[PDB]
Amino acid sequence: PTWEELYKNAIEKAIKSVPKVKGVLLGYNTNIDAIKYLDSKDLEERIIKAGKEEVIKYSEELPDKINTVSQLLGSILWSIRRGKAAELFVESCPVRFYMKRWGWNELRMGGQAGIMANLLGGVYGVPVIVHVPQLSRLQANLFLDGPIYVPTLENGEVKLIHPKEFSGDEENCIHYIYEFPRGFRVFEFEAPRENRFIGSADDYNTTLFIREEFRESFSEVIKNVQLAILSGLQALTKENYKEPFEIVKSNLEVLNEREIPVHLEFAFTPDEKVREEILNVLGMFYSVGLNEVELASIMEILGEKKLAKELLAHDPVDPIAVTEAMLKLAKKTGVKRIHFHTYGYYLALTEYKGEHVRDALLFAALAAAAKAMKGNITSLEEIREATSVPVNEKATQVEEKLRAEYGIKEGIGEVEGYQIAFIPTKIVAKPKSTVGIGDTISSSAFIGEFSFTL
Numbered sequence: 001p002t003w004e005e006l007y008k009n010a011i012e013k014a015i016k017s018v019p020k021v022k023g024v025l026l027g028y029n030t031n032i033d034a035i036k037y038l039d040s041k042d043l044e045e046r047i048i049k050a051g052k053e054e055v056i057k058y059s060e061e062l063p064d065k066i067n068t069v070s071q072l073l074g075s076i077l078w079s080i081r082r083g084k085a086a087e088l089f090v091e092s093c094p095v096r097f098y099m100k101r102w103g104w105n106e107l108r109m110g111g112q113a114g115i116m117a118n119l120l121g122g123v124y125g126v127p128v129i130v131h132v133p134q135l136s137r138l139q140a141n142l143f144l145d146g147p148i149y150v151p152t153l154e155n156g157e158v159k160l161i162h163p164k165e166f167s168g169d170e171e172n173c174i175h176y177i178y179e180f181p182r183g184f185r186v187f188e189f190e191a192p193r194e195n196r197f198i199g200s201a202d203d204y205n206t207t208l209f210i211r212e213e214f215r216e217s218f219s220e221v222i223k224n225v226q227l228a229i230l231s232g233l234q235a236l237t238k239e240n241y242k243e244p245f246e247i248v249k250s251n252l253e254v255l256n257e258r259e260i261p262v263h264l265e266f267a268f269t270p271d272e273k274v275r276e277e278i279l280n281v282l283g284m285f286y287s288v289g290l291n292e293v294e295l296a297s298i299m300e301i302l303g304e305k306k307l308a309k310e311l312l313a314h315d316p317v318d319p320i321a322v323t324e325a326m327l328k329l330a331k332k333t334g335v336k337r338i339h340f341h342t343y344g345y346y347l348a349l350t351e352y353k354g355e356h357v358r359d360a361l362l363f364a365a366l367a368a369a370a371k372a373m374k375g376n377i378t379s380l381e382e383i384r385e386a387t388s389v390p391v392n393e394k395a396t397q398v399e400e401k402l403r404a405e406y407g408i409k410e411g412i413g414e415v416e417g418y419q420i421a422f423i424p425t426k427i428v429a430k431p432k433s434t435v436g437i438g439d440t441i442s443s444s445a446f447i448g449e450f451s452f453t454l
């Protein structure tokens with residue numbers, strides 16, 4: 001059948017199957033996203049005030065973290081020039097102060113765990129248990145109403161309650177999101193693709209703080225979940241990763257023992273040592289999700305300089321280079337499923353076979369389109385409505401390269417024993433913002449694929 005027909009069948013199947021998932025554990029990063037829609041002249045003026053030469057310097061080479069305003073604006077410009085996503089820790093208090101005064105346009109739920117919780121529980125109706133480092137009033141009320149739960153303790157036993165029911169009022173953890181559209185101008189520079197740069201400005205998610213409830217009472221909490229999605233390790237450094245990693249590994253031991261598939265959402269991990277340590281534990285995960293920037297950063301530490309460069313080229317990055325990169329990652333770690341997403345198409349390399357892998361990708365692509373249009377999804381219907389968004393044209397050539405190289409048919413093929421699944425995506429011409437679309441894509445496909453096996 002045609003791609004349009006495949007999309008249609010996929011959403012109809014998912015609308016029925018997804019709601020059957022009994023429960024999903026989500027951790028560990030949840031925060032408040034302060035989203036700013038960049039303005040050309042405002043940014044140009046600020047770049048000159050900060051020191052333009054330094055700003056340009058950092059737009060050519062991203063720093064490991066942000067300690068100055070020139071580093072912040074230069075990192076934003078880095079993303080603008082390449083039309084690629086990046087995120088760095090704002091270590092400087094003066095810079096965070098500068099960001100607070102600079103402001104934002106809207107406040108939204110942020111973080112892999114937080115965003116996925118609102119989607120799966122708040123929209124899909126799938127019960128979820130989410131880890132929230134700091135449950136401030138603002139944080140709790142950014143959670144949608146529905147089967148979303150956080151663990152608490154009343155007399156030695158776990159009591160699951162909606163975030164809004166939490167009696168405390170902890171700290172507001174803010175991350176600033178700098179969004180820019182395709183064609184955004186800054187002096188002679190022009191954004192080749194709509195994207196954003198993130199300056200994380202809290203001191204809880206950045207150290208991968210994990211609540212007492214998720215420590216040794218974790219077994220009780222996950223008794224009724226069927227899947228788990230973990231993320232947040234991206235902010236750690238060679239100086240503070242040890243302790244958090246041991247907690248995560250303990251959680252993974254419990255999850256693996258109960259045979260609960262776990263998916264890791266990779267994110268921009270600046271510290272090369274931590275990036276390597278994540279790979280060292282990937283074999284404990286059933287699945288992993290990532291974009292072109294993230295896959296490139298992995299190739300970088302694996303010595304694949306060529307693949308890294310190709311994965312950072314203009315959209316759409318070469319699908320063969322991506323597939324070869326995924327093969328290297330799978331062989332190295334033993335992860336069972338790798339879901340790659342980029343602008344124009346998604347790919348999924350799995351050690352097992354099945355059209356349900358491709359169909360789950362199609363479901364996720366529709367969710368991505370809906371999210372791109374409204375900034376936030378309200379219902380499964382909005383996802384179904386996204387079928388009217390045309391499949392992007394450039395994906396035709398991408399599919400052809402894959403067919404010629406691996407012989408994929410209707411998006412499915414095989415390479416070295418693994419199944420390689422491909423789908424051309426539905427790109428929204430004038431998206432509101434880009435932050436969180438990746439999370440929508442990865443979580444929807446992971447839960448969707450699993451739901452298809454029920």
Ligand SMILES: Nc1ncnc2c1ncn2[C@@H]1O[C@H](COP(=O)(O)O)[C@@H](O)[C@H]1O
Pocket residue numbers: 085194290291292341342343344345368369372425426427428429430431434436437438439
């Ligand atoms: N205008 C758009 N329409 C549909 N999908 C989009 C659009 N802009 C970005 N995306 C998708 O959302 C993702 C954001 O990636 P990431 O920042 O890695 O989570 C990309 O990999 C694309 O698949």
Ligand SMILES: OC[C@H]1O[C@H](O)[C@H](O)[C@@H](O)[C@@H]1O
Pocket residue numbers: 029031033087109110111112115175198200267435436437438439
């Ligand atoms: O995927 C979007 C999310 O990415 C990272 O988790 C950022 O820290 C967070 O601010 C953002 O909401």
